[PDB]
Symmetry: C5
Subunit: 337 residues, 5 copies
């Protein structure tokens, strides 16, 4: 009668667990059990471009109804100890694209079981998962990624279980509080659907983030040095061929600086082995400075033979190099932006 | 009845544990159980800006009152084996902002259970937690950080549990004994409050450390070599332009060495979106040495056509550049201090 | 009586598990039990030549028949909770060449047990296995690797268990969706056989992939700088010996640059006991630039004595060096392709 | 009565464990139980100054007495399976300053339980632990570190348990067999004491090692190249100002080599706020070579008008610079070595 | 009562485990129980000089006799489930020199229990271990290490347990199939003896391998570039002395390149007190490329005094330096053989 009688509550719980078979899902052999899901994103730790995965920490909550656990005489929600979850049936929900996930267990396992008078069960966990995400890095470092978290029942088909987001589009909270330095979250989407494998149908939930990479750091750290080196190489064009030490020194310095910058950036860039926009841009700048040095060498060679042709070639190079470089850069930016 | 009669003590313990339902909190269905907490910090192992987290080892102790475990006739504090914690109810206290924490287990699980005659239980653990601490590296390496550890009940709301520091501001000890190689703990604070989530009000305790970095390592590591390289670049001014090869070689060598040093230091430093103060200083030094190189090239360009103007430019620069660098350093050390 | 009667299903399951011995294989002492295996490869996480291993995430399903588990009266397939797998006999199937393999356990253990009216048992796991694939890196980065996953029975010989691929060549799915940055899957094969060891004959199932390495990344990042530096070294032949000092620098620069590139590529692959194709190409480029510098030094040695021979040597080199390098590139790209 | 009656031995053991309570220490409520501890060190895997900790593998053995486990009629010592250790009370011994530790469990858990007729229990555990050792590197690489392993009971106070080294100073063996490539173990000390916390008094056993670093590697790695380069830098003084190219080359090469040595030193190093001995030495060498180059530049600036001034400066420097550098080296070695 | 009757075999197995005490070794209080051992080495994953340890995967089989498990009427070798190993007595065999080892547990724990009519028990495991191996790196990389694996009884003395190699020198197989990229296994040895500790005599088995390293990788990696840089230093001798800029640039570049190579090589191995062969050779190469610069400076010092003597000593240097360097290489490669 009185809710304060802990012996009465113990009797009720023992009656609920009396003859309770954890091997059988609720409504076994009947209608599928509907499971609602909530995700409270604590934070996103890292977004690894090298491994193409991201670490996500979240409060994952599942909401279902098992009439076997329905009780009476206690007008309260029984917030039981987490250990009782080992004595109850819980959905075999897993993440399709995770690689290494775990449940935090300090001080105790971060697990919560709440029972309601109508038999409703709420089961909460705190989970850190490293979810894989295939990244299209052709547009790097101006790409926009779409990283997904897929949630699926491992063993129960759609005839036995039906996932759905609990709360419409509000099923996932805390996205706006995510503090990602390198990336910025633009839009998150919730999808509920079914899939069909050789063993039958399966429910599926999907949480998708669209990450827009910040561009200021890359512009201020990778493109401007190469542009400055190209302009410095062009500086040697406007020095007379009477003395060769100045122009040779300028060309050598430009080549060495460009090579060292390329190597240094490659040592602080993702090691994914395929072509990127930044690599093409740097290689184009390298080709431009190499062509400038070639033209200076040819002019120096022919100066002792044909001064008039040397002057004409120098003037035409002064005409061609800047406009050609600007055309190349503008078409590159239009192609990528 | 005597303590020497270990059979009597065993019978008392067995009677305490008989009919003890671990799935219900003390005073279940009634007022919340007040839980006091003590933290005895052993050491802060590391504070990493790459992962933006700090590793902390501590003794975490929880004091609470459980009338079910009250015993009479034995006026002694019963220090039981840690395994008895598997037969007792314990709070589901967890850390809000950790990433990978564990309880040490050599030679046994570092766990302590102490019962008291009035029915009060003390439960102690030794926990090494890697708590995530978002850092504002804007003023690096002259930054001041504030790293917090949050303690919260996972399942039970404020109606079922309440937290408080046991000892006021003296609850957390061992802070002054912490030996951080690269930081100094200016202050620590203790906060007790209640937060609100969709499932209700939850108790919350906060332990905050304000850290200040030590500048000596970076002063003797990055700043002084850069200043020395800048002075070496200046040295070329005091060489006559008749032997231009020596000055050109010195300028090229200084530029290449400064670039290599800056690239290596950048490789050592982590990756953040904005620009660190150390990066700004290195950029300024490289700008100064590059401008010195370009100024010498400009002078040597018209060295013979207008020798008087070249000599005047060199004599002006020999005073202008040190004054400009001193002004830049004054602005730098005034803005960040 | 009713198919949806949970009590009836519980009684049937209890009778199935009552008197069931988990220490004895089905039809113990009789004909061997046949196990049919399906593999659904979700993704290949990474392939590493440093450790010579590949990470594989898959759904591994085993099919067998245990007449002790046959039940009647329920015309449905029982999808039991994964925790029932501990109460049944499961094959001792392991992977012969795995290093660190584990079964995912979030939120629950990624395990599925399905019983059928005729005693048929389907047992599915989600396994992330780091399989050791010995690699031949002689042709690297133009290599074509053959990586296999071996499946064997540990304790039971061919007299107690037999393996076959359920579904023939369609047993292993998901290969078409595998996305590898550095590799492209060419073909996958399934092999079933028996292997003889000192303890008897054991079943063996081999799943082999042939992987082909993409070459665009290495062409853009490694070969192009080498070719450009070699051409820059050639440039010196078009400069008269009157700038003998400056020419030195140019030649020096190339070698210096080459050395830097070599360092950039030094920490890329482990210590193979032979010569990789990329290392051979870099050695060839270094030899070419070194020989160009030696030729210039020889020219400078006799420049004062026999200038006509010096000019003749320069003219000969202008044709020999590009021709020899083109011949070397032709033979290299014919040998490795 | 027959020892070979394995059924009789099983019955005796079951009777010993019948009604046995693992939640109560031996002689609960009476005198504190005395635990004698032995340690057999197998190897110190590594000592890292980056994390300031050392990895240690040992054979931590404990010795106590529990009259509840006293058996009669069998004049033998019962070496039981390790699993029976889960059925007996064991001290809550832990290491005060360990970060990661574990008990090896291949092929079985490396755990040993031996029972004696009087009720005495011997409990062996093969343990690998990474113990944190705070290091003062202000004298690196001449430093002599002191790394301690602490052992303490967790829950029981001194009123419930007491710790003592079994065998006196010979409790810990195998220290001489440790061969650290970098350090050398000068001495090991054993301390038994009691500490006080807000929860009462606790026993404490300290095993301390004094590690003396070997300077042989560093001298032939860092000090010698810097000394050689600084001595080489004096050659620029002997060569007259007329051959300016060679002097410029010597100055540039000395500066570049010193800078590269400094960068390599900073490559293999942890982060500390103070100044280490080798760091100060490299800073001094760099200052000396930089001053030599600056002096040469000044001479080249003024030699165009006063060749006698340049000659006098060179002659004075050829004595001042070596004398100053030797004085700096001598004072450095006096300040650090002794 | 045929062997195919699973009920009879279950009864026999239950009878064997009826009253079996896992806390007592076979023949307790009597003669020691012999335990033969077999090792089937699958692979040696790595041999790292950084940590002075090597990884090893092997099938470890222990073969002994337990008369309490003797059964009759079933003329078959009972291959039981792996979990039955938790209900038997197994030796406490451990590895003396291992650092961290484990038994693979996918899909089940790799563990085989086989019983024979005469009570003989065969117990097999698949173990991956990290065995410590102190390496004498004085002659790196021309060294020849001897790495051992020690097998011992943790608790039982020679009075209770006597180890031996089952099958003599054939007790270890799979040695000839070991694939080490950097090492070649010259020989392996098996030793059986007894070792006296404070608690008495313990049986001991030793499995030793002698590994010889391969030199081609280091010949192509470091020695060849060092020799090339030494010849590059030699280049400056075959040049007219008046070309100060060329020789200065050559000397500076050679010194910088040699120092860069040495620095990029120093990080391979930890701070071993002794000096490796590589270190001695690199120091010698640096000495030669430094004496080249010193000789050039010495010539430039007496350039004004006796230019004829300058040319003569330049020719003598041309004669000497290659000969002295050849002598150095000859003695170096003769000592390390
Ligand atoms: C990152 O990339 C993933 C794909 O890899 C994107 O995921 C897709 O998201 C879109 C929505 O943005 C999904 O489209 C929607 O799918 C719903 C489910 O479809 C299933 O169920 C229906 C029946 O209910 C079947 O007919 C169908 O075949 C599927 O089995 C639909 O209900 C939605 O319909 C809505 O739009 C259509 C028009 O497109 C209207 O006609 C409808 O009336 C309705 O308004 C819709 O089609 C898509 O399914 C997702 N695919 C996958 C594989 O997940 C992420 O969106 C992307 N990230 C971001 C931020 O966009
Ligand atoms: C690192 O950064 C964190 C924040 O990110 C700082 O933490 C904050 O610390 C301050 C105190 O320094 C906290 O402010 C205090 O909050 C208490 C709790 O407030 C709740 O409860 C009260 C009722 O008890 C409600 O009224 C209130 O709405 C909340 O629900 C207050 O009790 C404290 O009151 C004190 O100040 C007020 C005036 O402001 C006085 O009137 C009071 O008498 C009393 O003195 C106080 O307001 C703050 O909540 C913390 N924030 C977080 C997020 O934890 C760390 O301090 C910082 N590190 C360092 C070293 O400073
Ligand atoms: C990577 O490299 C591995 C080797 O290291 C390759 O694996 C081998 O692949 C070949 C096929 O290319 C396999 O050869 C096949 O073996 C089958 C099994 O033979 C066993 O059983 C039969 C009885 O059934 C015995 O007689 C025999 O001795 C063996 O004990 C055969 O059935 C195959 O023959 C079939 O096809 C041929 C035509 O190709 C027909 O003529 C036959 O009638 C029959 O239908 C065949 O001989 C070999 O066993 C594999 N070895 C291992 C260790 O796996 C991988 O293929 C390679 N990777 C890739 C992608 O190719
Ligand atoms: C690394 O650094 C640590 C310290 O940080 C060193 O450890 C110290 O070692 C010394 C011994 O070399 C210890 O000194 C001895 O302590 C004993 C225990 O003290 C307790 O008991 C006494 C009463 O007996 C109490 O008064 C005290 O408060 C403690 O409760 C003492 O019994 C010893 O006494 C001896 O010396 C005194 C004079 O000092 C004589 O009067 C006595 O008769 C007797 O001869 C002694 O004092 C010291 O306690 C240790 N400190 C710590 C913190 O453990 C390591 O030795 C060092 N590493 C190396 C390799 O040296
Ligand atoms: C890597 O390095 C290890 C050592 O660290 C080498 O291992 C040694 O191997 C040799 C054999 O090659 C071992 O020598 C043998 O020791 C056995 C055990 O000796 C104990 O028992 C005997 C009595 O039986 C006592 O007298 C002795 O004191 C020990 O208590 C002996 O039984 C062997 O005797 C055999 O050879 C002798 C001749 O040498 C004959 O007279 C005998 O009849 C018999 O045939 C033998 O002496 C040595 O013990 C091993 N070392 C250790 C520490 O145990 C590895 O060999 C090496 N790797 C390689 C590839 O060589
Ligand atoms: C509380 O429950 C106990 C056990 O069922 C019962 O004996 C007792 O009477 C109950 N209290 C009241 C007030 O009924
Ligand atoms: C062993 O002890 C049991 C129990 O006392 C007894 O029944 C049996 O006869 C004894 N056997 C021998 C051989 O001593
Ligand atoms: C098989 O074993 C059962 C159980 O012991 C027994 O009843 C039956 O008779 C046996 N079968 C035969 C053919 O003996
Ligand atoms: N931290 C209490 C559990 C929770 C928070 N948000 C949602 N559920």
């Amino acid at each position: 009668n009185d809710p304060g009688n802990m012996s009465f509550v113990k009797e009720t719980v023992d009656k609920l667990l009396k003859g309770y078979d954890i091997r059988l899902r609720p409504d076994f052999g009947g209608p599928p059990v509907c499971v609602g899901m909530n995700i409270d994103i604590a934070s996103i730790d890292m977004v690894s471009e090298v491994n193409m995965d991201y670490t996500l920490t979240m409060y994952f909550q599942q909401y279902w109804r098992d009439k076997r656990l329905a009780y009476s005489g206690i007008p309260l929600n029984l917030t039981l100890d987490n250990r009782v979850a080992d004595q109850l049936w819980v959905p075999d929900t897993y993440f399709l694209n995770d690689k290494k996930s775990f449940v935090h267990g300090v001080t105790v396992k971060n697990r919560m079981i709440r029972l309601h008078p109508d038999g409703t069960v709420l089961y909460g966990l705190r989970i850190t998962t490293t979810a894989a995400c295939m990244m299209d890095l052709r547009r790097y470092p101006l790409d926009e990624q779409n990283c997904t978290l897929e949630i699926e029942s491992y063993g129960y088909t759609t005839d036995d279980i039906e996932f759905y987001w609990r709360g419409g589009d509000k099923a996932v909270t805390g996205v706006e509080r995510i503090e990602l330095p390198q990336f910025s979250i633009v839009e998150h989407r919730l999808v509920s659907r079914n899939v069909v494998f050789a063993t039958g149908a399966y429910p599926r939930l999907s949480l998708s983030f669209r990450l827009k990479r910040n561009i200021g750091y890359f512009i201020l750290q990778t493109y401007m040095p190469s542009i400055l080196i190209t302009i410095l190489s062009w500086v040697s064009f406007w020095i007379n061929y009477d003395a060769s030490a100045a122009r040779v020194a300028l060309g050598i310095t430009t080549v060495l600086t460009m090579t060292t910058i390329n190597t240094h950036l490659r040592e602080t860039l993702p090691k994914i082995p395929y072509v990127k926009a930044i690599d093409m841009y740097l290689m184009g700048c390298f080709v431009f400075v190499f062509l400038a040095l070639l033209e200076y060498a040819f002019v120096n060679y022919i100066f002792f033979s044909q001064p008039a042709r040397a002057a004409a070639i120098d003037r035409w190079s002064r005409i061609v190099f800047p406009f050609t470089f600007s055309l190349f850069n503008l078409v590159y930016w239009l192609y990528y932006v």
